[PDB]
Design a protein around this ligand. Structure first.
Ligand SMILES: CC(=O)C(O)(O)[C@@H](O)COP(=O)(O)O
Ligand SMILES: CC(=O)C(O)(O)[C@@H](O)COP(=O)(O)O
Lengths: 249, 250
């Protein structure tokens, strides 16, 4: 298996604690094979009654659906890392028998930094932000500037195409929870979406001890590498082709 | 010469309701459960495939929703929230689909100031859901009562304080829908700050939705349920025998 070998190299080069590389060769159902792979990794990492913090987007929602039965049975508590309420869970498949679900009551992005700060200070939002920063495990997707128009953050209308082009001009390669960072994994400073986001910042996300990124696609390799170099994730679930590309870059 | 069938009739004609269901009072059979079943069954006969249902806040509406999820799924019903108060929506909004359409106001039920509330009402993501909610075909809400004191959902969920509830009572209010409190005649009370801090649809807008089901029981809610019908906030009711009887002697 090329996959064990890729797992070993990624694990060594990025000093990861856990890695799964999925045969991404050459089958055309990767969005779902990823969610399966991250669900399995999360099943091995969470003990009963622990708390799992969840991120925004496609790979994490897809992962969450796979994990719904493990969630009830092991009584895992869920908490949202970001605003963007409806996009979450919204059905999701349920749970219960003492399984809490804690949701930031706010959009992902406010229209101004002033309003973002106000919302962050509301009690119902502060309470969930604290919970999230206290989780045992986090699961997040990673977005890439180079996806341009396919990016979830563009297709949800959370940023404009103009914003994305300036974000790229400014040196960003990728994002986690809407926060964008450069090739060395540092969060880019002069970007106004950052102060408009309602959720946990990246510097707080790193308090969570096990942080799993699920992301594939060759156009994400640069972004995923920079996320590992920044330390925002310390475990990775991806596919072979993406794994290859990450290593070369 | 009076059981549930005549209560239904009397209620229908006293308050000019289009649909009413009064469930019999039993030994200890949990009305909250049987109210949800009754209201679910009422919504099943009223919603057509692909129509949009607006959902209120609280226990009777969540109990109803859970009983209604197979019908929501098979009939492709769209759901939309009438109020903020999001993770609370989950009970509920869980156990669903996801061949869905669930529109949720991404905001809390009550903001900590009227300015903050105005600001949230004007964010795009909220404004769009508010519009959608006012255009629903059918609404399902609960009715709260000031007489319930500390057992009211709005106290147990921490959305108002005890002092607030006392002052609200002193100002003449007898009940609420969606956190808007009204007096015995069904008029929204004037000098109440929570009103300007609520994020959801107001009561005057709720009246645009053509079929509005209230679901509510217990003798302590009788005066509130009556006021809600005199206000016109609901035009269909699901309740239990004893409650229906106390209401008729309002
Ligand atoms: C918006 C955001 O958080 C992201 O970091 O841009 C995620 O959407 C990326 O995940 P995905 O490509 O799986 O949707
Ligand atoms: C808070 C609110 O909107 C309300 O009208 O008081 C509802 O909670 C009342 O319904 P319930 O007693 O079923 O929870």
């Amino acid at each position: 298996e090329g996959c064990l070998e890729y797992e070993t190299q990624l694990r060594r080069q990025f000093s990861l604690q856990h890695v799964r590389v999925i045969p991404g060769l050459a089958d055309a159902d990767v969005g779902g094979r990823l969610g399966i792979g991250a669900a399995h990794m999360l099943m091995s990492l969470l003990q009963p009654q622990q708390m799992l913090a969840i991120g925004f987007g496609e790979a994490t929602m897809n992962t969450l659906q796979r994990l719904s039965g493990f969630i009830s049975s092991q009584q895992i508590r869920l908490v949202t890392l970001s605003g963007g309420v409806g996009s979450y869970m919204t059905g999701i498949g349920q749970l219960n028998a003492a399984c809490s679900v804690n949701i930031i009551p706010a959009p992902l992005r406010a229209s101004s930094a002033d309003i973002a700060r106000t919302l962050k200070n509301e009690n119902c939002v502060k309470d969930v932000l604290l919970a999230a920063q206290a989780a045992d495990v986090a699961i997040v997707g990673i977005g890439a500037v180079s996806q341009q128009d396919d990016a979830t953050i563009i297709r949800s209308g959370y940023i404009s195409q103009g914003e994305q082009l300036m974000i790229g001009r400014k040196g960003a390669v990728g994002d986690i929870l809407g926060y964008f960072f450069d090739a060395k994994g540092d969060v880019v400073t002069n970007i106004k979406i950052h102060n408009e986001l309602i959720g946990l910042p990246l510097s707080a996300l790193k308090t969570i001890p096990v942080r799993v990124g699920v992301a594939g696609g060759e156009n994400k390799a640069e972004a995923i590498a920079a996320a590992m170099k920044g330390g925002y994730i310390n475990a990775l679930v991806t596919d072979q082709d993406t794994a290859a590309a990450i290593l070369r870059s």
